[PDB]
Assembly symmetry: C3
Homo-oligomer: 446 residues x 3
Amino acid sequence: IQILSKSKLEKCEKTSDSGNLNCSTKIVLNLAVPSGSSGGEASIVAEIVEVRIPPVITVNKSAAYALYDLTYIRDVPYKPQEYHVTTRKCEPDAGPDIVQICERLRDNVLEQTQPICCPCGPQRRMPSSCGDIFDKMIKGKANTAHCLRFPGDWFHVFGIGQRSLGFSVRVELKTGTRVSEVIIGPENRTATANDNFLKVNLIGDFGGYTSIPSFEDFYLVIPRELGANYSMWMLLERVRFTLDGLECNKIGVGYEAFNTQPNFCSSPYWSCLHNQLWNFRESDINRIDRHQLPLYGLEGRFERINQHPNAGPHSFSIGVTETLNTNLMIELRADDIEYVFQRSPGKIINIAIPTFEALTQFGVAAVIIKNTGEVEASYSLTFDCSKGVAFVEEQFFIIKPKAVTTRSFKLYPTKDQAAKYICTAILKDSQFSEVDRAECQFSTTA
Amino acid sequence: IQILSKSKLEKCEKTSDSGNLNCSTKIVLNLAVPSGSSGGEASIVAEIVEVRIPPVITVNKSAAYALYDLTYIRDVPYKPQEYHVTTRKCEPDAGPDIVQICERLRDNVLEQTQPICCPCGPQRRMPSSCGDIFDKMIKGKANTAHCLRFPGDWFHVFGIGQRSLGFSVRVELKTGTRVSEVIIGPENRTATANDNFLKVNLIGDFGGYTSIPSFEDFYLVIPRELGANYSMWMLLERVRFTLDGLECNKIGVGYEAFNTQPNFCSSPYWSCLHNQLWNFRESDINRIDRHQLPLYGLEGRFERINQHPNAGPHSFSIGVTETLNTNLMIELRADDIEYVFQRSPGKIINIAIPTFEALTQFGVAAVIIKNTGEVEASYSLTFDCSKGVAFVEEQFFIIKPKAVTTRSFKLYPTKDQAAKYICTAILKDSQFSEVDRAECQFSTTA
Amino acid sequence: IQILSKSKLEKCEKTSDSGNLNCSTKIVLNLAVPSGSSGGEASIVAEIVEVRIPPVITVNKSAAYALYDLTYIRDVPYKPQEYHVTTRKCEPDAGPDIVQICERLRDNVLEQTQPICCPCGPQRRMPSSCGDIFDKMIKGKANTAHCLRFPGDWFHVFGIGQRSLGFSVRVELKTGTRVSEVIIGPENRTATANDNFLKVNLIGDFGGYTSIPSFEDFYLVIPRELGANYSMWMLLERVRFTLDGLECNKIGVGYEAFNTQPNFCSSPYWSCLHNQLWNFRESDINRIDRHQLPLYGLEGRFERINQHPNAGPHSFSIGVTETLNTNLMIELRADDIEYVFQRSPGKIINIAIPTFEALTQFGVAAVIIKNTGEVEASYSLTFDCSKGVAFVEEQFFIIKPKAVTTRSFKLYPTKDQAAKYICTAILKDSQFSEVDRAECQFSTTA
Ligand SMILES: *[C@@H]1O[C@H](CO)[C@@H](O)[C@H](O)[C@H]1NC(C)=O
Ligand SMILES: *[C@@H]1O[C@H](CO)[C@@H](O)[C@H](O)[C@H]1NC(C)=O
Ligand SMILES: *[C@@H]1O[C@H](CO)[C@@H](O)[C@H](O)[C@H]1NC(C)=O
Ligand SMILES: *[C@@H]1O[C@H](CO)[C@@H](O)[C@H](O)[C@H]1NC(C)=O
Ligand SMILES: *[C@@H]1O[C@H](CO)[C@@H](O)[C@H](O)[C@H]1NC(C)=O
Ligand SMILES: *[C@@H]1O[C@H](CO)[C@@H](O)[C@H](O)[C@H]1NC(C)=O
Ligand SMILES: [Zn+2]
Ligand SMILES: [Zn+2]
Ligand SMILES: [Zn+2]
Ligand SMILES: [Zn+2]
Ligand SMILES: [Zn+2]
Ligand SMILES: [Zn+2]
Ligand SMILES: [Zn+2]
Ligand SMILES: [Zn+2]
Ligand SMILES: [Zn+2]
């Protein structure tokens, strides 16, 4: 937490146009509140002059998350299946004795559920044998039955709309020996406490240097209320789905699309049943087995999934990993202000960077730091690397004197050839002066 | 409008490196100007000491809009149509007497406009009858003619580039009994008034908590210069279009794509003519008939379409529904400053929330508020709901003492089952203290 | 550079909970640092009172760029080619004497590399002649061989992740006649200089009015380590690629997709080989030949490609053309502060606007300006146009007294018909007062 400005201003309240206005001199403060503040790192003490204990203010800010406004579209099956039935005489208006596993649903009769009969032999959809003339003359002409059924798991298809940034700002005030809590957020961004002495107003946020995804042209697939919890949750492009169920080889095929097919008995098996949810889940599994980031699945690429307050099953939100400075304005009924901050030295314990692939993989530099002081203090950490590795953002954090904090950085090299780099981790305190420096051996595999 | 800081600073102008510099002490102010301010809610009076009426400043800000830089690509038809002609002898180089409605355009001859002849009978593109041998021996062999024509409406295809935020900031100055207007925006963000006494500079905007769409991978279709005005205006994905006219079943098909088709007489009717503008318009109509938000059409999902100044037919902009705090800096040639704000009580008249579907629909809470005071004053409104409903952003507005304002909130429940919730609307004044509280019965349909 | 606030604040450092805290009164400054500042335009002189040369501070800021976190997916060929071989007896397990250019790769044997034999004559994939019965009775039955090979150039397919904003802020301090440099950026945003006298902290950025692309659903194709340097670099939609190599007519086709084709000998030539990298490169060439902006190619639409520090071949970044105000906080160990800015008059030399097409093209207004003064000073430029042309953002720049600067504006008309417009260019100094006005004749072609 850093004070942007301290200023004295005479605020005058007006109630009637004809009547007289009453004034009151207040002390307006502009604050930059970063995400992760607790209050135990810095305090703002107010000095009041009357014409006995001074009021102390401590500001706490929670981690940020991005909530996405979901709109329900239509239910979709996980694995649509095509069944082959090698029998004798075939007809779409047949019984289970000659169609076996195919059949037809009567939930009443459905003309699109009935199977399609194709001739026997090779070059056809299903390769079979026509048999002999004498077996054909009694049992009937050999035919293959093809049907579309939807067994197994089902998924919800949601449309990602606007993205909403959410958090909570706790303002603690000590008039004497008694505490008063003020909760400020995007939902409730204006508050007053203890007989109009305090005025907390949330103006906005100071622009970050890392983007938050919008997921504009994507749909979210949620399993109906094997693999991990959010690994089944996928973000797939809108063009990949067939909401009308009239398009082939797209997520959400219908019976009408499959039955109305160009050259059904000539086209290969499993046609009109390609690029489904199982194909996209399997492509992630193959990528995860090779120890790489998934392309569609949520788990692995996003941090803190659905860990937001007032959560639900049909709700989607991702954690904002970047530290954001939130512009807060505290307007006090005092004469002046004193800013009391806490400082405590710290040391870098050990940096753990594992060996990773040339460009298919990225680096993770786990840096654990201990507070060697006696009081809870603010900290800064810069992770500088060689010409090959791209710049990494500075990390802000508050460590208790009896605790440790693990801080990881994503390392991105620009070279293809297996090269050796050197990284220097610089730790700073509430005072922007360096407390400890550390080096680490870094190398990639071709 | 809220004052971030008030500060005295000695500004010194330099003209020559060798020469002497002249100083002047000025009073710099940092302001957070929200969208919707008029000036009648708060005033900033300057106190000048010389070695008679004080100058009063009032700042007005307009509602925000997002303008999209459109680039013309190519014209596209609304409904491309395939015509069937059941005749006798067929040939692509035939006359209108034996091709009827098909024919060919001579705007000169066009080899891609001529129809394609297919054999008679079933299993073909068009189901017909071959007739008898004796009718065939005189009139000719029976054939079906198929042709591609483009009748009806046409549309413009534009590429959405960068998004530009636009608004206007009016700065009113009263030196005596005479007014002076200063218009500040992203186009003109630096101004000075009345012999260098005033200095208005627009630094930037304070980060909002709601996203504005970019429409990156989308194209805008505009009808050529039934349905509503902007309901015909659609935002469709770039992959859905065939700008080259060589791809089948994509928006903007050509004659070449249709003529060069795999197994033309074997493939079903209306092939190469799927997923066109009419299919996307019809899918919106079906969604609107079921009282749900459209997927492609502009009207229904976006507020204030093309209501921006300096508008045109080949221009696109959407209104920014979220209130944005604009960072303005007023630098005055005075000794000090007095901030005179207006306060007027208000009461919640009635909350109107209609019953809506489980997840296919969202809620709208119409809250009408009256200014019970005597002067124009600023207001705040928080709409808190149960654990199931997600957080809604705080609304800022200015109400005249002889007027009312309707304020609607979008309600998003997280549960699928028909549940009953309770919502509490809290109204605040220019003073962040609550003026009126109101409750409402809330329930959804399964 | 503009001072947002100047404030005196007593900062008190705490080391132990039981122990006593030491105070120090500091002078906190809030600054809006725009991109392009050098230091020679304005200086901030500090006045220190002790109980001899004053410290002078000059702040320089570099131009901004947006860096995209690339993740490697798979290699892709530029032009996959299908070869036709008109021979006699054909078989997939044949020798080079009867398959000619087709053959098969043995890098060992590959069952998917072997060609496919199709019957002779018309209506087939390749139109040929079956010859005579007597030529067939000795040489063999006539057949056509079809094979898929990947000759020529190859490309890298990268997944665009998060966007990171990068720049550098230089803080120059003169204690006496000796200089001290402080480099502040998103990587290192906290610094202290000359025995805790200076405290530079980077809070964030002030919201711009122009968007920066995210490229969410796009992939970047880079040629393997004719056309320009970055013209071969393309941004193509994720749906356009077939990473699995199982889909036809999509970027990155495999042998399996081509061999497993519906009615191979019936379908037209070059099938399963459509919509490849060469098709997208050619569509840009045709657009560039007609003097229009490319759709996929990087060069032409984006400014300053890969001109960022710590660059590489597998790195992607675009220059931020919009001027951004960066919120910097300088906290000094002094009693007061004096702001000394430089002012120098300037004149508009000549405006060069070429005649362009109705809506397929956009305008470029090259405005060259000279500093007629004696010292390096800040400048402002507004380019107002008629009702038809949309609003253009104000441009900030610093010109040396012995130099000139060319400033171009993108002009977007809203009318389709060839109309004549009038544009007024207004130049301003460090003082927001107008120095020079200029008009220009403007017209478009239908
Ligand atoms: C902020 O306060 C909440 C309780 O209201 C607490 O759970 C949270 O841990 C505090 N923040 C920090 C960073 O300690
Ligand atoms: C703001 O409103 C929310 C929701 O009603 C509530 O939880 C919070 O405590 C409120 N803040 C204050 C300071 O009362
Ligand atoms: C701001 O001023 C314009 C006239 O310049 C006026 O039309 C507008 O209504 C004013 N804004 C408000 C919120 O009253
Ligand atoms: C800023 O420029 C625009 C366009 O020329 C104009 O409408 C506006 O009045 C200008 N503002 C001032 C303060 O002159
Ligand atoms: C800022 O300083 C660097 C050297 O550190 C210099 O190259 C650059 O030109 C300076 N910026 C400007 C706008 O002059
Ligand atoms: C900040 O860190 C970077 C990388 O180590 C370095 O180049 C820069 O000079 C540092 N800034 C200061 C003020 O030391
Ligand atoms: Zn038998
Ligand atoms: Zn569910
Ligand atoms: Zn498949
Ligand atoms: Zn007859
Ligand atoms: Zn038009
Ligand atoms: Zn259709
Ligand atoms: Zn011969
Ligand atoms: Zn390479
Ligand atoms: Zn092609």
